[PDB]
Write a protein that binds this ligand. Structure first.
Ligand SMILES: CCCCCCCC/C=C\CCCCCCCC(=O)OC[C@H](COP(=O)(O)OCC[N+](C)(C)C)OC(=O)CCCCCCC/C=C\CCCCCCCC
Ligand SMILES: CCCCCCCC/C=C\CCCCCCCC(=O)OC[C@H](COP(=O)(O)OCC[N+](C)(C)C)OC(=O)CCCCCCC/C=C\CCCCCCCC
Ligand SMILES: CCCCCCCC/C=C\CCCCCCCC(=O)OC[C@H](COP(=O)(O)OCC[N+](C)(C)C)OC(=O)CCCCCCC/C=C\CCCCCCCC
Ligand SMILES: CCCCCCCC/C=C\CCCCCCCC(=O)OC[C@H](COP(=O)(O)OCC[N+](C)(C)C)OC(=O)CCCCCCC/C=C\CCCCCCCC
Ligand SMILES: CCCCCCCC/C=C\CCCCCCCC(=O)OC[C@H](COP(=O)(O)OCC[N+](C)(C)C)OC(=O)CCCCCCC/C=C\CCCCCCCC
Ligand SMILES: CCCCCCCC/C=C\CCCCCCCC(=O)OC[C@H](COP(=O)(O)OCC[N+](C)(C)C)OC(=O)CCCCCCC/C=C\CCCCCCCC
Ligand SMILES: CCCCCCCC/C=C\CCCCCCCC(=O)OC[C@H](COP(=O)(O)OCC[N+](C)(C)C)OC(=O)CCCCCCC/C=C\CCCCCCCC
Ligand SMILES: CCCCCCCC/C=C\CCCCCCCC(=O)OC[C@H](COP(=O)(O)OCC[N+](C)(C)C)OC(=O)CCCCCCC/C=C\CCCCCCCC
Ligand SMILES: CCCCCCCC/C=C\CCCCCCCC(=O)OC[C@H](COP(=O)(O)OCC[N+](C)(C)C)OC(=O)CCCCCCC/C=C\CCCCCCCC
Ligand SMILES: CCCCCCCC/C=C\CCCCCCCC(=O)OC[C@H](COP(=O)(O)OCC[N+](C)(C)C)OC(=O)CCCCCCC/C=C\CCCCCCCC
Ligand SMILES: CCCCCCCC/C=C\CCCCCCCC(=O)OC[C@H](COP(=O)(O)OCC[N+](C)(C)C)OC(=O)CCCCCCC/C=C\CCCCCCCC
Ligand SMILES: Nc1ncnc2c1ncn2[C@@H]1O[C@H](COP(=O)(O)OP(=O)(O)OP(=O)(O)O)[C@@H](O)[C@H]1O
Ligand SMILES: [Zn+2]
Lengths: 435, 149
């Protein structure tokens, strides 16, 4: 309604650096296409963009400009389609419905197999269906609902994300799409082949919960270290088994509960000795000595047995096994430190210029205004889109300069540790004093 | 405690936490990431459910448990999926060696001996050394974060 309000909303400003290392302020109109940028995509980019070797996110932010433009174009195209857009807007609802259905199906299977808010209402309806129709019909209905809801969720996911915008190859390469396809296949298997396949769907908890994902990362980050420690444990077990087979063959007597003698020799062969050690010594707190024949102090090999058991216990149980847990704790610490560093950087430094919030103290302009009005990464994206959408025939000085810098793949036009609102005022003031 | 039953006085011992700040910080070291601990427990439950399904499908006869009947001494603890899940979730988690510490001892001549060995080893590595230790790792991480803050 208000022309001034409309122009203020559709007008943006940025700061650039020219070839002579001089800072200039450019005021431009926001292209209409820029209005179709999703807040989810903006947040994802802001929280995922990484720093380069020089500590700048500008390289990645610029490299994502084409993807952002294509995503905005796809969103504009989709918004003309009401039904598909409406379905795409409810991805969270579809995912929640699918997860609840999977949980209910798994609970029913656990509590009844073998056989033959609105959540309380859903539970009551499920109980009534079980009482009236039966477990089988209830499971069939739940499986059909889960399959339909997952199909709707996949349609919504593709529509909203525009993964096809990068091509079918990119969509296939995407891990999330493959995960959704595998989930659909698992649901189909549960519905038709055997209901027990529904148990696999419980792994969707990891996908849904980020905290559990971080906990799992604490183990998977140093998975190579864990596997190497396990291999070292296996080598030590092999050596101990060799020693036992050479000198303690008769002490490997194991009780057995034969199905319709009660003891057997478990070290007649090297492979059997290795298997017995690797299993029992590792699964017993006291080590291999907890299953070997109990010796007597009068035996000549009693000191040897004591030394063997003690060495196994100290070397394998207290050290080797605890190394995996130590690696897990170290990974926990490293993840926490990295996350804290990243959050501190993101919250106390400027995305474009990288200046800290401590140069802006005691000045007309604060960090908040500097990030909302002067170095807006989104305003830079809008300027990039304008340069790419504007006919070359009506470029201005700075528009042509930025277009040429883009043609040459040069980022030196983004400011870096410099702000027109920070040092330009004092610089002009000292210049006036000098003059 | 004064009127209904004197045993209610035991609840008053929780005032120690209120009185002592150090114990309160120790409890905070666990309660700060309570959601993480609960999610880890749910993951453990899901893994136990999968292992119980596998055992019921292929190792039904090996779930024999001794019982001290009040005035046969063994019973089958995996005749149903729910019973198998309960037995695993209890014994495997409360035994250092895992679920294998309560299953029937096999013989090397049995055709399923390698399968039993693999099952027990997988349960031990996946659930006992990793999943259970994740809660303790979370507690240690919370300790470190609290001290740093
Ligand atoms: C006993 C042994 C047999 C049963 C266990 C065997 C198999 C079933 C495994 C199902 C695992 C479910 C894990 C996720 C879950 O728990 O999601 C509950 C969902 C609601 O999801 P939401 O979107 O609100 O998730 C919000 C946050 N999130 C995801 C952390 C809850 O459904 C609900 O609430 C419905 C819950 C109804 C009550 C069922 C109680 C027992 C089974 C499962 C619940 C979890 C374990 C409880 C403790 C069991 C101790 C033995
Ligand atoms: C637990 C995983 C799901 C297992 C599952 O639904 O079993 C389904 C069938 C069970 O019927 P049955 O043939 O035994 O007897 C026929 C019919 N009855 C059992 C009533 C006698 O099993 C079979 O087909 C038995 C032979 C194949 C079993 C493996 C099925 C494929 C595995 C899928 C998931 C594997 C990954 C596990 C999670 C970790 C991921 C990293
Ligand atoms: C339900 C199970 C369905 C069947 C899955 C197996 C079939 C084969 C699939 C091939 C692809 C497997 C790898 C997929 C990696 C996907 C990825 O890159 O995401 C990893 C995600 C974590 O999700 P996030 O934290 O990145 O997003 C969370 C955002 N929120 C919270 C808004 C939802 O974890 C995950 O998929 C963890 C999945 C663990 C699967 C275990 C084996 C089954
Ligand atoms: C471990 C103990 C097992 C616990 C039960 C849960 C099993 C499922 C584990 C899912 C792991 C997963 O979702 O991945 C976690 C990390 C992701 O790391 P990031 O945040 O840097 O990924 C950046 C990209 N973003 C975030 C989009 C993915 O994975 C990686 O990096 C490397 C993943 C290597 C694959 C093995 C992970 C450990 C589990 C093995 C047993 C089989 C599980 C079946 C699924 C295997 C494929 C996942
Ligand atoms: C912790 C670090 C890890 C491992 C080191 C463990 C060392 C264990 C030593 C066991 C010694 C033992 O249990 O022996 C006690 C026996 C019992 O005497 P009795 O009165 O029942 O028998 C009458 C015989 N009468 C009169 C001579 C006593 O008497 C004896 O010492 C009998 C004579 C034993 C002579 C051979 C000793 C070999 C032991 C250790 C050397 C290797 C150390 C390797 C470190 C790496
Ligand atoms: C040692 C033999 C190993 C036995 C079992 C495996 C490992 C035992 C614990 C680690 C020992 C170790 O790597 O030692 C290293 C020390 C170094 O010390 P440094 O002052 O030169 O500093 C130099 C600093 N740097 C190393 C950075 C240059 O070497 C020394 O001098 C220590 C010399 C000790 C010689 C007698 C060894 C008797 C073995 C006892 C085993 C007890 C194990 C108990 C716990 C585990 C079993 C469950
Ligand atoms: C331990 C908690 C206090 C329990 C307590 O004082 O029991 C009192 C009564 C005991 O008499 P009785 O009826 O068994 O036999 C009648 C008389 N006689 C026992 C001599 C045969 O118990 C009863 O009323 C028995 C039935 C109710 C028991 C639960 C009492 C209410 C629970 C309160 C605290 C719960 C939280 C525990 C701390 C964790 C907080 C997070
Ligand atoms: C004696 C028990 C009496 C019955 C209690 C249960 C009845 C239900 C109560 C509803 C409220 C429960 C939550 C209260 C939170 C209070 C709060 O906000 O304080 C948390 C305090 C820690 O006290 P602080 O370090 O903040 O102050 C210390 C300052 N100084 C050292 C000078 C004294 O811990 C606490 O109450 C921990 C209390 C733990 C109760 C367990 C369940 C019983
Ligand atoms: C855990 C293992 C159990 C150990 C036995 C002791 C049970 C009593 C635990 C008392 C916990 C408590 O006093 O709270 C600790 C934290 C407080 O955190 P903050 O310093 O940021 O609080 C800022 C405000 N300020 C300081 C004034 C409260 O609580 C929170 O934040 C979240 C508290 C969530 C409630 C569950 C806590 C864990 C225990 C569960 C079993 C049932 C205990 C009954 C009492 C439940 C209510 C407390
Ligand atoms: C640590 C990582 C976690 C798990 C991996 C554990 C692998 C356990 C391997 C057990 C192997 C075992 O205990 O076997 C030893 C038996 C005993 O031989 P005997 O002289 O008493 O019997 C006479 C028969 N004669 C002449 C052929 C020897 O002989 C044999 O190997 C008999 C032939 C066995 C063939 C099937 C082997 C399946 C095992 C593993 C593959 C899956 C690995 C999954 C990893 C994830
Ligand atoms: C793996 C299957 C899982 C088995 C049991 C559960 C988890 C075992 C330990 C964690 C394994 C894990 O997440 O691995 C991850 C490694 C990654 O290493 P990367 O060099 O690519 O670094 C890439 C760095 N990132 C991940 C940040 C992108 O994946 C790899 O490449 C490792 C490829 C290894 C393939 C053979 C797997 C045989 C399984 C052995 C289980 C032994 C467990 C012993 C202890 C637990 C049982 C009590
Ligand atoms: N250069 C930057 N440095 C730090 N944070 C930034 C930067 N540019 C943007 N942000 C933050 O990223 C988010 C994007 O701000 P944006 O102007 O898009 O907000 P908005 O409220 O959605 O917009 P508007 O109200 O102007 O229509 C905000 O949190 C903003 O503070
Ligand atoms: Zn800036």
């Amino acid at each position: 309604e208000d022309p001034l309000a409309y122009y203020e909303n559709h007008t943006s400003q940025i700061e650039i650096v020219r070839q002579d290392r001089s800072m200039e302020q450019i005021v431009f109109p926001v292209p209409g296409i820029c209005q179709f940028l999703t807040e989810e995509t903006k947040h994802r980019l802001f929280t995922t963009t990484e720093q380069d070797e020089q500590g700048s996110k500008v390289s990645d932010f610029f490299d994502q400009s084409s993807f952002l433009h294509n995503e905005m174009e796809w969103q504009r195209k989709l918004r003309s389609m009401p039904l598909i857009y409406w379905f795409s807007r409810r991805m969270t609802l579809w995912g929640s419905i699918s997860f609840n259905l999977a949980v209910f199906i798994n609970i029913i299977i656990a509590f009844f197999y073998p056989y033959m808010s609105i959540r309380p209402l859903i539970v009551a309806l499920i109980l009534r269906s079980i009482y009236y129709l039966g477990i089988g019909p209830t499971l069939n209905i739940l499986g059909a609902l889960n399959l339909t809801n997952k199909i709707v969720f996949v349609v919504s996911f593709v529509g909203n994300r525009g993964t096809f915008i990068r091509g079918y190859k990119a969509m296939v390469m995407d891990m999330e799409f493959l995960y959704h396809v595998g989930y659909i296949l698992t649901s189909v298997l549960g519905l038709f082949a055997h209901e027990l396949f529904y148990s696999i769907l419980l792994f969707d908890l990891i996908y849904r919960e980020e905290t559990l994902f971080n906990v799992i990362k604490s183990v998977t980050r140093n998975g190579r270290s864990i596997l190497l420690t396990a291999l070292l444990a296996l080598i030590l077990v092999y050596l101990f088994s060799i020693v036992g087979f050479l000198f303690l063959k008769d002490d490997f007597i194991l009780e057995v509960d034969r199905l319709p003698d009660s003891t057997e020799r478990a070290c007649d062969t090297l492979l059997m000795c290795i298997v017995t050690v690797m299993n029992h010594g590792l699964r017993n707190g006291g080590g291999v000595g907890d299953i070997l024949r109990k010796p007597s102090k009068d035996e000549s090999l009693f000191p040897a047995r004591v030394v063997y058991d003690l060495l196994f216990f100290f070397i394998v149980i207290i050290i080797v096994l605890n190394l995996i847990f130590g690696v897990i704790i170290d990974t926990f610490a490293d993840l926490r430190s990295e996350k804290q560093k990243k959050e501190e950087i993101l919250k106390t430094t400027c995305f474009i210029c990288g200046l800290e919030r401590d140069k802006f103290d005691n000045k007309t302009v604060s960090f908040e205004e500097h990030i909302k009005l002067e170095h807006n990464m989104w305003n830079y994206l809008y300027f990039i889109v304008l340069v790419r959408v504007k006919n070359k025939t009506d470029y201005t000085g700075p528009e042509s300069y930025v277009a040429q810098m883009i043609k040459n793949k040069n980022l030196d036009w983004f400011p870096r540790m410099r702000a027109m609102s920070l040092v330009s005022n004092e610089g002009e003031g000292e210049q006036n004093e000098i003059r």
